[PDB]
Ligand binder design. Structure first.
Ligand SMILES: CCCCCCCC/C=C\CCCCCCCC(=O)OC[C@H](O)CO
Ligand SMILES: CCCCCCCC/C=C\CCCCCCCC(=O)OC[C@H](O)CO
Ligand SMILES: CCCCCCCC/C=C\CCCCCCCC(=O)OC[C@H](O)CO
Ligand SMILES: CCCCCCCC/C=C\CCCCCCCC(=O)OC[C@H](O)CO
Length: 386
């Protein structure tokens, strides 16, 4: 189902880095960020899936077929940058997990991950790979209960509070890792077909089934993300630990549960998430290219081009977790440019048919878009001026 692929993409190294760094640096105070981002992601993924089901065309294809040529050029370029950032995050996460597993430097780890992507790109194994991530998520769900978190701080973390200079930055990172624009584009394509009869009855059936699937998947994965942040908080926040929040250290979150094999299991799960999410990211990037332009560059060429930012970042000596969080921030910045056409098209009868979005949900989505735009503007204000 498309919800499985969306949940695979929602469990990427970017999500891992954001959850762990948020926990370690700010305690439970971003649980409300995670919850709100998960709700917005539910709404937006539902809107994109409904767009796909009702119109038969995905969001990039509709943009290309309905909007002026220069606007389509701009949209293709921005979506390509979004895909570059997403694949950078996921590929560098896979490389960092290879490093944690074997001991190789980041360069040769990225080389091994490139060989693995070459081996995979020949082609059902990504859901099996994702099962590792699902199991480490269950491990986190148990570790939350076992770690005995401070329920007072946990409850206080659900009240919306941006406290500190980098709090807005990390909340933007969480929102970008949860509401992924490449997945906003890809979800419409995942439900484009499989419709034997174009009737409104079957379209409504698909809409409801996909709604249930995506809500279940996003709810489970948001429970997992909140659990990861809570364990990271209870593990590194109050205690003064060096390099707290780095994914190299994050294995200590599951030490009281797994024991000596905690680091190996965390490295394996992060590699699994990196590979699966990178496959999903290359799929979404090819869908973006096709929908926006009409033609396609070779898949191996796109893979080799998307490896270039990863290898450049490795050569620059930049920190992997830091650049992952930055990539998720860039994704959050890219979110509104994808939300606007989605809302406009889902509020149109000539596009949706009898499945036009309810005006209440359209207003909710516009409120979400305004919130995200204001948060991105506030982050830009803090990062550039006073
Ligand atoms: C200061 C302004 C903030 C004021 C507060 C505004 C909050 C609105 C934002 C997020 C909640 C929206 C998500 C809650 C609804 C979730 C419904 C859902 O998940 O399903 C959607 C449905 O399937 C569609 O087709
Ligand atoms: C046992 C496996 C089932 C897992 C069930 C899902 C766990 C909760 C999920 C999300 C909330 C995470 C936010 C933290 C909420 C408070 C943490 C908590 O529940 O603590 C338990 C209690 O303190 C102990 O005595
Ligand atoms: C952040 C600030 C704006 C993000 C909103 C992005 C707005 C994207 C351009 C506006 C638009 O989508 O207008 C298309 C119109 O339908 C063509 O006929
Ligand atoms: C607090 C700021 C207001 C936020 C949301 C209000 C609803 C936002 C409305 C967005 C305007 C763009 C639009 O959707 O225009 C449709 C128009 O009704 C076609 O006739």
């Amino acid at each position: 189902r498309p919800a499985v692929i969306a949940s695979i993409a929602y469990m990427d190294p970017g999500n891992f880095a954001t959850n762990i760094e948020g926990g370690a640096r700010y305690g439970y105070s971003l649980l409300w960020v995670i919850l709100a981002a998960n709700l917005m992601a539910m709404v937006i993924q539902n809107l994109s899936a409904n767009l796909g089901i009702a119109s038969g065309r995905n969001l990039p294809e509709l943009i290309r077929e309905r909007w002026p040529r220069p606007l389509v050029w701009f949209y293709w370029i921005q979506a390509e940058l979004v895909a570059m950032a997403t694949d950078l995050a996921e590929f560098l996460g896979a490389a960092l997990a290879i490093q944690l597993l074997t001991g190789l430097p980041m360069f040769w780890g990225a080389v091994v991950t490139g060989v693995v992507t070459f081996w995979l790109l020949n082609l059902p194994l990504e859901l099996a790979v994702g099962a590792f991530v699902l199991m480490i998520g269950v491990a986190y769900l148990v570790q939350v209960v076992l770690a005995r978190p401070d329920l007072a701080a946990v409850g206080a973390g659900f009240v919306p509070r941006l406290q500190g200079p980098g709090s807005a930055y990390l909340a933007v990172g969480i929102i970008g890792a949860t509401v992924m624009p490449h997945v906003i584009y890809l979800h419409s394509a995942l439900t484009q077909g499989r419709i034997q009869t174009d009737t409104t009855e079957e379209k409504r059936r698909l809409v409801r089934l996909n709604r249930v699937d995506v809500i279940a998947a996003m709810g489970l994965a948001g429970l997992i993300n909140m659990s990861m942040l809570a364990v990271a908080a209870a593990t590194f926040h109050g205690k003064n630990v060096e390099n707290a929040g780095d994914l190299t250290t994050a294995y200590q979150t599951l030490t009281p549960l797994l024991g000596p094999a905690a680091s190996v299991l965390f490295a394996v799960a992060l590699l699994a998430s990196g590979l699966s999410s990178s496959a999903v990211g290359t799929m979404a990037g090819d869908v973006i290219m096709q929908g926006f332009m009409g033609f396609h560059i070779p898949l191996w060429l796109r893979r080799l081009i998307t490896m270039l930012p990863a290898f450049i970042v490795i050569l620059l000596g930049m920190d992997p977790s830091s650049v992952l969080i930055l990539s998720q921030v860039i994704l959050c910045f890219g979110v509104p440019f994808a939300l606007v056409p989605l809302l406009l098209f889902t509020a149109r009868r000539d596009v949706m048919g009898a499945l036009v979005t309810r005006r209440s949900f359209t207003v909710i989505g516009w409120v979400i878009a305004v919130i995200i735009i204001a948060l991105n503007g506030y982050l830009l204000w803090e990062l550039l001026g006073g």
